[PDB]
Write a protein that binds this ligand. Structure first.
Ligand SMILES: Nc1ncnc2c1ncn2[C@@H]1O[C@H](COP(=O)(O)OP(=O)(O)O)[C@@H](O)[C@H]1O
Ligand SMILES: [Mg+2]
Lengths: 51, 50, 386, 99, 69
């Protein structure tokens, strides 16, 4: 934690509603998905979830 | 190569605008000269008084 | 509600290809509405290279004021993208480099610069390290291939797309490729493969950049009736939950499908005539509109004769709402072609059905396709020697 | 992680690709990055992505004694890894705290 | 020479007479464990195409861990 050692500290907060949608949009491509899935609703169904 | 300039090369005058440019199992039945099936059917629906 | 937003980018807009084809038809060349909507697409997107080809092939009057204002913005935007690529290659990283040359490719593709777009997309693919980003470029080339019916472009990129989907198991992109492949199969009269690919993606359709879902189901029904057997049609199309839902809002296509299945031959011919005019005006089905209608007529005649040992000419004429002379001429043409397993007893006006074995039909194809193969083998040896 | 991708680029991508930007700025090239957050938030996902995009060799240092035969027969210091890190420069040495 | 792949193996498969007499019904109250093993061992062995069509990557291995007994 002393200054000068780690030149940048990057935070990775748990994904919010929109970021969870993007992660959901990414991993769902590897599946045979029926058209019309409401991935937004599933993202809202997972508060405080990790990628 | 000994190209055949002896034989009269009739002028092309062709359509260089991709006239067909297709690869199918093309057969002679598509080139039969006839009216469209709608015209053929429409020309026979009223032949029965309908 | 977000269906259209799920689709891939509309570049090139395949509606323009349909619009361009419609004006090529003698019937619709003078259509003001089709001209106006095409010009709206050209004016909105500043398709200067497309305007030159549009005016050259269709013999139009080039608006110098419109062309110059469209060429100037193309130069201004291309200069902007060149500056962005220059800025990215000097200060930003490789990913920002790729996005710079990607946008140059889309703009060239948007304005109709086909040769420039292919070169730009090829350069983008070379230094694109993401697999899905690479596959988006391939799908861009496939859309370009469909736009100009470049078979060499479609076949090469379809093979490239298949490889990329194998490395990364992208089932979503795999579903889109089937719709792309099915559209090409329709364009090349491969209705047997088009039906198989369309039916697989009828419940996974998200390729809205190519077509509307209603139009996609319309094509799926059309290719199914000509390429599927009766048992296969009832399980997939007649009882298809996804297709039946769409057919509620498409009474004409549903009537066309169920008229043949329910043996309503008089209505089916009326529906087939309606379908014929749709496919003549459709850029994909236009080269095959005569073939499709003829094959569908063969299906209806064969279906009526399949269950009966002998059917009179009048009954068959009455069933199809046509005259006896029409049915006699149509049968004699189809029996001579070997596509109907029946013979006409014209004196008694009785059509007696035959049951030729599958061995004969297979043998003719083996003779036919083998002779086609042998001609290639003979021709290739000619190239080899000299 | 669009914000995070930009942050890690300015420290691992730019110094490798454009050393002149830091020399012109007169600042030392960054060498240490710490990605912190709840598990499963993409820290290892992003670290591997940058190494993939910058053509930097990605080395994961778990301290495993199963991999010590590849690091070196000595295994007295973890700095023996630098021999194989220098040979594959540019390199990214990644360690994840299980905690 | 090249030997057959099934040859040269000090470890042999289970013969029919070496099959244990333990049934699934012999095991009581392990439905969660029985399901996971089935979905990860015996179902991919017989439904490998259904995994591929759906898009699931079948697990190559399964680790069973817990207190003894
Ligand atoms: N933000 C994210 N976007 C996409 N995938 C993610 C994200 N976060 C985690 N994953 C998925 O989770 C898996 C493991 O995440 P990992 O990076 O190991 O977590 P951590 O950041 O705690 O190391 C990865 O294979 C990745 O596909
Ligand atoms: Mg972890």
């Amino acid at each position: 934690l002393r200054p000068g050692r780690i030149d940048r500290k990057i935070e990775f907060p748990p994904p919010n509603e929109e970021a969870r949608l993007d992660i959901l949009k990414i991993h769902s491509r590897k599946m045979n998905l029926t058209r019309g899935i409401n991935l937004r609703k599933i993202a809202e169904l997972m508060p405080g979830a990790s990628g | 190569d000994d190209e055949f300039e002896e034989f009269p090369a009739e002028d092309w005058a062709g359509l260089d605008e991709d006239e067909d440019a297709h690869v199918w199992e093309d057969n002679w039945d598509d080139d039969n000269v006839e009216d469209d099936f709608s015209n053929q059917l429409r020309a026979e629906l009223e032949k029965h008084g309908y | 509600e977000n269906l259209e937003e799920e689709g891939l980018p509309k570049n090139p807009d395949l509606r323009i290809a349909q619009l361009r084809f419609l004006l090529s038809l003698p019937e619709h060349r003078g259509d003001a509405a089709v001209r106006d909507e095409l010009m709206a697409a050209v004016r909105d997107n500043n398709m200067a290279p497309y305007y030159e080809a549009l005016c050259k092939s269709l013999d139009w009057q080039i608006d110098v004021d419109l062309l110059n204002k469209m060429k100037k913005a193309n130069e201004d935007e291309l200069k902007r993208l060149d500056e962005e690529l220059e800025d990215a290659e000097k200060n930003l990283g490789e990913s920002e480099i790729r996005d710079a040359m990607m946008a140059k490719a889309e703009y060239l593709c948007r304005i109709g610069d086909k040769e420039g777009a292919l070169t730009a997309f090829r350069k983008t693919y070379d230094k694109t390290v993401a697999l899905g980003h690479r596959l988006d470029i391939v799908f861009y080339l496939l859309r370009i291939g469909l736009f100009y019916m470049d078979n060499d472009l479609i076949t090469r990129n379809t093979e490239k797309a298949k490889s990329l989907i194998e490395e990364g198991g992208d089932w979503d992109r795999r579903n889109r490729l089937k719709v792309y492949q099915g559209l090409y199969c329709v364009a090349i009269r491969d209705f047997k493969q088009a039906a198989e690919l369309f039916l697989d993606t009828v419940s996974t359709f998200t390729s809205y950049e190519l077509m509307d879902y209603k139009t996609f189901v319309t094509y799926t029904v059309y290719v199914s009736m000509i390429a599927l057997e009766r048992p296969d049609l009832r399980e997939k199309v007649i009882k298809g939950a996804e297709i039946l839902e769409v057919l509620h809002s498409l009474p004409a296509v549903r009537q066309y499908l169920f008229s043949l299945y329910e043996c309503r031959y008089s209505v089916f011919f009326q529906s087939l005539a309606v379908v014929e005019q749709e496919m003549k005006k459709d850029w994909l089905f236009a080269p095959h509109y005569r073939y499709y209608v003829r094959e569908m007529r063969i299906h209806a005649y064969s279906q009526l004769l399949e269950s009966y040992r002998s059917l009179t000419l009048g009954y068959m004429a009455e069933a199809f709402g046509v005259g006896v002379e029409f049915i006699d001429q149509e049968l004699s043409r189809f029996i001579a072609a070997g596509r109907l397993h029946c013979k006409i007893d014209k004196v008694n006006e009785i059509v007696e059905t035959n049951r030729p074995d599958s061995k004969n039909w297979q043998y003719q194809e083996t003779i036919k396709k083998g002779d086609l193969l042998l001609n290639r083998v003979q021709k290739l040896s000619r190239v080899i020697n000299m | 992680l669009d914000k995070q991708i930009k942050e890690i680029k300015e420290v691992i991508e730019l110094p490798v690709k454009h050393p002149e930007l830091f020399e012109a700025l007169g600042i030392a090239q960054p060498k240490g990055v710490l990605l912190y957050g709840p598990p499963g938030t993409g820290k290892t996902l992003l670290a591997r992505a940058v190494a993939h995009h910058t053509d930097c060799t990605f080395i994961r240092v778990s301290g495993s004694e199963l991999v010590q035969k590849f690091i070196g027969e000595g295994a007295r210091m973890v700095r023996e890894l630098f021999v194989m890190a220098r040979e594959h420069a540019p390199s990214i040495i990644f360690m994840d705290e299980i905690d | 020479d090249v030997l057959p792949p099934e040859a040269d193996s000090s470890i042999m498969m289970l013969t029919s007479d070496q099959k244990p007499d333990v049934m699934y019904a012999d095991i009581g109250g392990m439905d969660i464990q029985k399901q996971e093993v089935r979905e990860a061992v015996e179902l991919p062995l017989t439904h490998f195409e259904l995994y591929k069509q759906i898009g699931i990557d079948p697990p190559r291995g399964v680790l069973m861990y817990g207190p003894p007994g």
